[PDB]
Amino acid sequence: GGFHRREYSIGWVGDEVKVTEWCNPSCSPITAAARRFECTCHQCPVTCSECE
């Protein structure tokens, strides 16, 4: 744990692209699924520069 892991989802319809982005705690699992996890290590910050 300790920081924010930036998460992205790049998807499309035809060649029209939509990007979703958010932050996970660095202690949370790395997954292909688009998940929003909570911090279990208790050392991860509430926000970073990237999520305000």
Binding site: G1, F3, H4, R5, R6, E7, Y8, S9, I10, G11, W12, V13, D15, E16, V17, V19, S26, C27, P29, I30, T31, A32, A34
Partner: protein, 238 residues
């Protein structure tokens, strides 16, 4: 509109005509892919050799369509060339029949035009552009601590994305060192990577010798590396 794509579609039409099939689904779509997958299985059951090999080859072309659409033309061309190079190797130098001859000659007829279309410098599509800007912005911003994983749907996609990074020196100039990461089991779609090779790649990612893994989703079990500070999901949901 896309002459390379158009050639591929023309070829696939020829093959469908040769084995006399006309599926409701459109080329390049998942339900079309699932349909080829069923036809191929049935042909092995019923022992229909013509139908089995045609479905097998049609899958290689469907795969090339998807690479063309999501990464580059050159990578789609390489996917097909490598496949036909392997077929030539294992079968034309035997248990070779009319369908093998027909498919191989059909590709060779088109190979040089496909090659030259692939060699023409093309602008990147929006998907790859968005991927580039995401990698670039993240790498400039986080610099030496940039540690990322890109998840993609297929082995051939992960390999192609890696080749594209290498082909593009600007990535290297902001620190990017990428490598593909794929499973050990046999797939018709692509070569495997041994569990050993996987472990070495991951080790290099741990030490920072590699800082951008491009993996299939069927890897996530052993990719829980706390130091990763970015994950990009590239076309997992379409």
């Amino acid at each position: 509109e896309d002459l390379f794509k158009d050639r591929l579609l023309e070829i696939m039409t020829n093959i469908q005509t040769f084995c006399q099939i006309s599926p409701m689904s459109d080329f390049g779509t998942q339900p079309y892919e699932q349909w080829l997958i069923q036809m191929e299985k049935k042909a092995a059951r019923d022992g229909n050799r013509k139908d089995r090999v045609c479905a097998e080859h049609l899958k290689k072309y469907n795969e090339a369509l998807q690479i063309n659409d999501t990464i580059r033309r050159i990578d789609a061309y390489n996917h097909l060339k490598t496949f036909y190079n392997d077929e030539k190797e294992k079968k034309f130098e035997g248990s070779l029949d009319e369908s093998d001859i027909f498919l191989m000659t059909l590709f060779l007829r088109n190979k040089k035009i496909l090659k030259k279309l692939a060699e023409n410098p093309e602008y990147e599509n929006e998907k790859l552009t968005k991927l580039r800007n995401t990698i670039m912005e993240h790498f400039t911003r986080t610099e030496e601590s940039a540690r990322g994983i890109i998840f993609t749907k297929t082995r051939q996609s992960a390999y192609a994305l890696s080749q594209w990074i290498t082909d593009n020196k600007k990535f290297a100039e902001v620190g990017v060192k990428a490598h593909h990461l794929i499973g050990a089991g046999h797939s018709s779609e692509f070569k495997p990577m041994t569990q050993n090779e996987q472990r070495e790649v991951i080790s290099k990612f741990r030490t920072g010798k590699i800082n951008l893994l491009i993996a299939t989703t069927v890897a996530e079990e052993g990719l829980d590396i706390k130091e990763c500070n970015i994950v990009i999901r590239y076309g997992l949901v379409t």
